Design a protein around this ligand. Structure first.
Ligand SMILES: *[C@@H]1O[C@H](CO)[C@@H](O[C@@H]2O[C@H](CO)[C@@H](O)[C@H](O)[C@H]2NC(C)=O)[C@H](O)[C@H]1NC(C)=O
Ligand SMILES: *[C@@H]1O[C@H](CO)[C@@H](O)[C@H](O)[C@H]1NC(C)=O
Ligand SMILES: *[C@@H]1O[C@H](CO)[C@@H](O)[C@H](O)[C@H]1NC(C)=O
Ligand SMILES: *[C@@H]1O[C@H](CO)[C@@H](O)[C@H](O)[C@H]1NC(C)=O
Ligand SMILES: *[C@@H]1O[C@H](CO)[C@@H](O)[C@H](O)[C@H]1NC(C)=O
Ligand SMILES: *[C@@H]1O[C@H](CO)[C@@H](O)[C@H](O)[C@H]1NC(C)=O
Ligand SMILES: *[C@@H]1O[C@H](CO)[C@@H](O)[C@H](O)[C@H]1NC(C)=O
Ligand SMILES: *[C@@H]1O[C@H](CO)[C@@H](O)[C@H](O)[C@H]1NC(C)=O
Ligand SMILES: *[C@@H]1O[C@H](CO)[C@@H](O)[C@H](O)[C@H]1NC(C)=O
Ligand SMILES: *[C@@H]1O[C@H](CO)[C@@H](O)[C@H](O)[C@H]1NC(C)=O
Ligand SMILES: *[C@@H]1O[C@H](CO)[C@@H](O)[C@H](O)[C@H]1NC(C)=O
Ligand SMILES: *[C@@H]1O[C@H](CO)[C@@H](O)[C@H](O)[C@H]1NC(C)=O
Ligand SMILES: *[C@@H]1O[C@H](CO)[C@@H](O)[C@H](O)[C@H]1NC(C)=O
Lengths: 495, 497, 496
């Protein structure tokens, strides 16, 4: 009829929820979100270094010096490059650009260009380096031409065969770009370069190529029915390059020196620049976040969290919050805040709550050991930077898309399952911890007290604030109340 | 004995077996196999849409119209394309087909061609459109030729320059195929085309080309020593194509309108179609899609289960089956229980009793079927592999493709296997917990009113008929009611009775 | 007050430490490291078959017969090809080898060449097969040239058109290599081959190609400003190849028969063969492949363990070591107990002594050594990387291939780390459960005839001696037969 002690556990006001492999929407005591899902809608600069936003200039446009990309004629250093989905200013004069995508992929490994001149327009004596302009490349008004290459026209009805060498004495790699003109007619050829059969031969310690003009009738594009095929090579230091040509040569006036290699990318965003700083950016926005995961977009540059195709990823830190003298068989105690598991005693003197400090900090330490482990354990999740492919590279494009989405699916599965399988185990680690300290108080006071069936013990010898601490301490001396209790339960047996 | 209650669990004779991570081959009561292992050996329609059967024809054969191959004159829609692995009827006149494999890949995202005329054979008045036939492409026995292109010959010992344009007035894309002829020797060039230096030249909005013949002396394939190189493009709508040739031109007569882009495939299979239909086609037969997994072939088309390199995959859904060849759950299952996974065996008088904790039984069943659904949910969005062809100088990217597909098939085969193995051990781990929770539920109520035997039953320190039974099942047991009765019970045997 | 039976479990001297998901450095009685971490720094034969050591030669130099490179006249088979990272003898005459990477791939699935003659060097009755030499291909001072091709030159200011056929009347596939010569100017063209307009054409069933020489003026490399481009095809059996050329032709003298196709590889190492043998080799050395996993280097060939980028990976097998008036499992483990994992202790009238529960201890050894093999087993199929090479202009697929080699490595490191951690947890929690379930075997037998002392021991109310102890150990305590004696003494203890 008195002097008791109950085993119980923390409950509270929370209603955050987690999931388990078996049961879903389980309400828990505490729970951490590990998935960031919010991004500012702005293109920011990575680690203090601003991107190169090309507005609607294509990279081809940029590198060739399209007459409408004059903004980026001398572009500074860049963290990343943002091209729009379909840039408007590219090859204004129709034609193609060989190994284009392979060139853009090299850019992702470079951070700064120093454009230097090798063949000054002034050096084209014995040819016409002035009239080579067209209405396909208007400046302001009409008819200009790419700024970084020159279109050589016959002069005084002679196109003397050209031979010109340049020597990278620099210590940095050089990017050189040249082209060849594909005219409409047998007549347009003679009119432009006099000689009917021509060729453009370029030479490197690496690169041996001859090009001959494929001459044909075509639909006009941006006004023109002819086309220019463009070529590029990387000339290493101490290496030299030799051009020889009898016509249709589009020669380079400039080259780009690769002054800073390193991490970079080309992102496909129609957004534009804002004045912020970020450690991780995305086609749709930047991310301030210490979360281990995010779900805003597969592509992301910089030191940043790690993308998952999921809508929620919350981890269970505390108890199933099932709030309800009573004991743990009927629910959790709201009246205890000291810890996760603890006791309630009654006695002659008065009642009170007390946490099992030993078990709860071990819980805390063992739960923190898991969450910190999991988050910053497997850091090698498949992060990426995308790439482009041309109209006859479809199979390897798919190969790439197939693989990229392949690892996306694998890692999200890994994340989802770990969260669900660990939510299941912490939730019944808690369950177990409250059972074990129930057993530690019953193996202490043995037949000195009566199992009630609610999680509570009535005593046969009545003990207070020192023996209550003594049962809480794992210190309770059974032989001291041995024969005191024996007399009461021997009295209880008769009446 | 005087009045007992027992707690025990369902058993039956079901020799279904499951594996777990720790132990193998454990006989359960209930188990859901989830791995389809069978196929029907036929090639079928895909939910009503028939596959395009090329029989003995290669894709190149069909498109160029090799006389041994037939035309799909109704212009059907297909669900997939079946080609023999080594098709007899391809480029009957020897040559090659540039970016053949890229084109074949395009086909896999297309479901319906309609063939149209762009250059009628009756429109080459300036040249010979009839004599360009050959013994390597027979028909009636007579020497014939590809039906979709035209071998133009010098007319009257003259080969006037050819300029023709075609404008895609349609809203559909157009696949156009033309070629060039490579003769044996300088004399053949003159004999067929007069002009001894020639080119074939095409101009679209984004394609630019001027190709010239390569004279070599070659072994006789199919009886000819000259060759034919073929090219294809896609002429986008509102665009135009212009051909310039001064000899050796193999002119397109037709063109194919892509009128359905969709999900399609090129299966390489030797079988032939019969009247069946399926949700899921593989090269060696069709399989049912009732189950989430199959091990029949990694290339399957349609609403398919997910493929895993495994021989068995059985999900434990019930209990262990340890029956007794009386006592409760410490010696194993009762087959006396019909409805209910966890029940009682109340004994009062010399007959019997077998109930079922209906409640904790329908809490296990409502989570085992729940979590099962959740397992099959978690994989679906797995890796599915895709057919793709390569040639003899793309052996690297071919190997990359194959390593990556075997790669992900291995990952998920491991993922699925280890996921069920764990769910099997934890599904049975929950029955042991569930039965031990049934025992303790009664125990917390009865206290010193009943005696524990290490058996799973409680002999009663008083009398309990049917109503007292249902009371302890429903958790509504009045210890302070029989307490007094039970105490005098208990004192008799402690003294000597 | 006496006569005891205590439930306990094993301890020992172990320093060893495993990890779980929520515990780090946990000391266990027994464990098993499963990650190979060292190598011998030698390069070895692969189970009795030696690698092809190219020394300082590229695959090109070896195949074409660069003079500094040696013939493998013995036609040996090989396990794997070893080539340095920047070999020093390649295309001594500067030039290009088309689809070179494609060729090496074929090599990496090829295990034995036999070299055969197809166009004997003496056979060019109307051309110069001897002046074709260069200062860029020095063999012992004087000028020389690739030993397996022949640089055919005009005889007496004449280059009669060339047309030669070879029929493959072997059963194997043949590799045939040929090439073409791009001169510096139009002058040297006529100086070597006279005929100014020229070509080199190759016919097979599956090969049509006529190259024409690209004359430009290039930088000098190993002395030369001309260049030679090389080609290769694979001529199927019963097929013919016929070459037509009016100049600049570099005719093969020899062909290679692929006589053994199979598993091979091209390793990039700088070591040298060491008169040793292994089951698994890596560019840095051979590894002792008897663990299931290693972290030595990603590219490893042969019957190899599965590679993971961990620094440590060790399974749990025995109990958690917590040793230290005898008490049961609640105070920890018994260093006294040796013959098993779980078991009992008696403290009766004859003395004290430990006994193991073999029946339960074995079902635990049975399983745990089972689950071990089952972890080596479901990594039977993991992911092993294969060497592939690419040129600049294939830098996109090169990255694609390395993003995905790295991707699978990372996935499988995750799984291996995560599987060991999680079953370490379940191994220990298993031991927990057995020790508990052992206690209850005794607690449900003895029933009202013993009291539970709350530390894993029982005090019998009756006398027990040796064979009733053996009785409860054996799962057959005759409780009908001592309740009498116990019923007496509980009444004795409840008052007196
Ligand atoms: C490989 O090439 C080198 C240089 O072309 C050869 O010469 C020796 O190379 C080593 C490098 O391992 C140098 O340190 C020595 O000084 C060189 N000479 C001598 C006499 O040792 C080397 O012989 C070639 N072969 C091999 C198998 O390395
Ligand atoms: C819950 O209780 C806390 C006080 O401990 C209070 O600050 C908070 O606003 C309450 N509301 C919710 C939604 O948790
Ligand atoms: C689970 O929780 C979410 C959030 O409240 C809710 O939308 C959903 O209906 C819940 N349960 C089920 C079975 O969908
Ligand atoms: C190109 O960018 C400019 C920048 O002001 C923008 O005004 C324009 O809308 C873009 N082009 C087109 C065709 O919309
Ligand atoms: C290029 O410069 C290097 C020295 O920097 C020199 O060795 C080489 O001869 C030069 N080449 C030419 C064509 O001037
Ligand atoms: C497991 O038992 C099945 C009986 O269904 C038998 O076919 C199989 O061989 C056994 N496998 C093992 C590994 O014991
Ligand atoms: C699919 O199920 C039907 C009955 O629903 C069965 O007759 C048929 O054999 C099954 N298909 C296969 C491939 O086993
Ligand atoms: C396809 O070729 C095989 C091989 O000769 C032949 O048996 C079969 O009849 C051919 N099919 C048709 C429709 O010609
Ligand atoms: C197609 O028609 C003619 C070709 O004769 C051409 O002049 C015209 O501009 C084209 N128009 C289109 C493609 O809309
Ligand atoms: C094609 O051209 C017509 C008229 O020039 C135009 O109305 C139509 O939208 C265009 N469609 C495409 C797909 O180019
Ligand atoms: C585990 O052992 C290593 C060995 O000294 C030590 O560095 C580490 O701190 C230990 N434990 C933890 C919890 O990190
Ligand atoms: C290889 O194995 C043997 C025997 O297991 C051992 O003695 C030796 O030290 C090992 N060496 C290396 C380098 O792994
Ligand atoms: C090589 O084969 C050709 C054609 O395949 C044949 O005519 C001849 O028998 C063979 N040549 C020689 C020289 O045997």
């Amino acid at each position: 009829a008195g002097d008791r002690i109950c085993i119980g556990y923390h409950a509270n006001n929370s209603t955050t929820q987690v999931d388990t492999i078996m049961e879903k929407n389980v309400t828990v005591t505490h729970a951490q979100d590990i998935l960031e899902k919010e991004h500012n809608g702005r293109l920011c600069s990575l680690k203090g270094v601003k991107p190169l936003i090309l507005k609607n200039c294509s990279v081809a446009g940029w590198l060739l010096g399209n007459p409408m990309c004059d903004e980026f004629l001398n572009a500074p250093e860049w963290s990343y490059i943002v091209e729009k989905d379909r840039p408007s200013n590219g090859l204004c004069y129709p034609g193609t650009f060989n190994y284009y995508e392979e060139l853009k992929h090299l850019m992702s490994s470079t951070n700064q260009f120093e454009k230097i001149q090798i063949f000054p327009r002034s050096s084209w004596s014995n040819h016409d380096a002035s009239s080579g302009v067209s209405s396909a490349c208007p400046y302001n008004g009409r008819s200009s031409f790419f700024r970084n290459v020159v279109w050589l026209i016959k002069k005084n009805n002679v196109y003397r065969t050209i031979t010109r060498t340049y020597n990278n004495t620099n210590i940095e790699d050089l990017l050189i770009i040249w082209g060849i003109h594909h005219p409409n007619n047998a007549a347009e050829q003679i009119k432009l370069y006099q000689n009917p059969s021509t060729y453009v031969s370029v030479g490197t310690s690496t690169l041996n190529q001859r090009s001959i003009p494929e001459i044909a009738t075509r639909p006009k594009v941006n006004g023109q029915s002819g086309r220019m095929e463009f070529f590029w090579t990387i000339l290493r230091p101490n290496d030299s390059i030799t051009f020889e040509s009898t016509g249709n040569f589009i020669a380079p006036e400039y080259a780009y020196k690769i002054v800073k290699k390193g991490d970079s990318a080309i992102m496909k965003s129609e957004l534009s620049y804002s004045n912020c700083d970020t450690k991780c950016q995305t086609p749709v926005g930047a991310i301030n976040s210490s979360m281990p995961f995010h779900n805003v977009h597969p592509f992301a540059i910089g030191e940043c969290p790690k993308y998952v195709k999921l809508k929620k990823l919350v981890l269970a830190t505390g108890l199933r919050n099932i709030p309800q003298i009573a004991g743990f068989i009927e629910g959790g105690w709201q009246g205890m805040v000291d810890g996760w598991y603890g006791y309630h005693h009654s006695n002659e003197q008065g009642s009170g709550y007390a946490a099992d400090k030993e078990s709860t900090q071990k819980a805390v330490d063992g739960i923190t050991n898991k969450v910190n482990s999991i988050i910053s354990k497997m850091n090698s999740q498949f992060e990426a930077v995308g790439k482009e492919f041309n109209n006859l590279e479809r199979r390897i494009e798919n190969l790439n898309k197939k693989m990229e989405d392949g690892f996306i699916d694998v890692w999200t599965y890994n994340a989802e399952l770990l969260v669900l399988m660990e939510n299941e185990r912490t939730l019944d680690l808690h369950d177990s911890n409250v059972k074990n300290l129930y057993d530690k108080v019953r193996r202490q006071l043995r037949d000195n007290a009566k199992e009630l069936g609610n999680g509570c013990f009535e005593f046969y010898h009545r003990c207070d604030n020192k023996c209550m601490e003594s049962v809480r301490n794992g210190t309770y001396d059974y032989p001291q109340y041995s024969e005191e209790s024996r007399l009461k339960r021997e009295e209880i047996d008769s009446g």
